Design a protein around this nucleic acid. Structure first.
Ligand code: NA
Length: 295
DNA sequence: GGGCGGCCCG
DNA sequence: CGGGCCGCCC
């Protein structure tokens, strides 16, 4: 019951981290979504800062007239190889295919991966979400839109791994995939703030609680910290930089572990618990990796 | 063929 | 870490 540990023995049967990214790693195709031109993505509202999260926090419904080539965005948050801006729409799953991987499951080489993103909830007027998908699959995705009502931002993500022979790599029953659900920060208070969350695990997936994590399943079904761990106003006294960093000893404060006996699938998003007037509560960075913040 | 892996080279 | 060319395999 010690902190940073799961109460079930966990093995990193799958490896999907910085070590799997090669010289050849990139997004080779994005299918099923309207592209957002980089010149449109890069504009911000009057008086806004110029960061990727602010650029995500605008309603781009009907402003997605790009193609694969001109959707390419350069932003340091994306890594040195950039990424692609895409509009997510209800019922229109977007398949991002990564090639040139050197990942591995039980020594079985994983060279390709398909990340399929499907809008589930959006608080903008258009009901759409904006996405930038990084060419680095460990940086993965930035999602957001403008907030006009109290609705969650929510996106479902299904991941399929492929070996060199093009066949899907799925787990042995006794050797589940383990993947990190990290950086689930929260500023929620009695009436303000927001939390990033994961939820809606796929069949044969399960969330595993990390001892000492503030992230647990709430009665609304989602996994988040229901109290502020970002600004120091909650009973834990925690601020974001007290735990939210890659490699931080206490990063498990905002993390869980996903375990999958089958194809990986789950949703992630942001919740204000129904409040419409919470600032900077509609854009997030969701990174997928096996960098478990647990032992 | 086109996409994608595994090569080479440098 | 770029680029090409030669595999093979959707
Ligand atoms: Na976060």
């Amino acid at each position: 019951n010690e902190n940073s540990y799961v109460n079930e023995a966990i093995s990193k049967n799958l490896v999907f981290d910085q070590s799997v990214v090669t010289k050849d790693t990139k997004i080779s195709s994005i299918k099923g979504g309207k592209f957002i031109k980089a010149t449109d993505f890069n504009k911000v509202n009057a008086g806004d800062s110029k960061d990727i999260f602010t650029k995500l926090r605008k309603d781009m419904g009907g402003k997605a007239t790009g193609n694969f080539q001109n959707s390419f965005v350069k932003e340091a948050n994306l890594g040195s190889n950039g990424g692609y801006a895409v509009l997510l729409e209800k019922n229109k799953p977007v398949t991002v295919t990564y090639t040139g991987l050197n990942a591995s499951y039980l020594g079985r080489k994983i060279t390709k991966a398909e990340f399929v993103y499907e809008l589930q909830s959006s608080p903008s007027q258009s009901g759409t979400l904006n996405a930038v998908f990084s060419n680095d699959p460990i940086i993965t995705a930035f999602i957001g839109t403008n907030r006009v009502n109290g609705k969650d931002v929510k996106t479902r993500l299904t991941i399929k791994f492929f070996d060199a022979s093009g066949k899907e790599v799925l787990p042995d029953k006794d050797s589940p995939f383990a993947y990190a659900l990290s950086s689930l920060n929260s500023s929620l208070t009695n009436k303000g703030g927001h939390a990033e969350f994961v939820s809606d695990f796929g069949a044969n997936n399960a969330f595993k609680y990390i001892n000492g994590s503030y992230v647990k399943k709430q009665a609304d079904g989602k996994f988040y910290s229901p109290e502020d761990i970002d600004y120091g106003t909650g009973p834990s006294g925690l601020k974001n930089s007290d735990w939210d960093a890659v490699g931080h000893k206490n990063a498990y404060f905002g993390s869980g572990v996903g375990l999958a006996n089958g194809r990986i699938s789950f949703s992630f998003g942001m919740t204000t618990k129904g409040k419409s007037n919470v600032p900077v509560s509609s854009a997030q960075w969701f990174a997928f990796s096996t960098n478990l913040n647990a032992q």
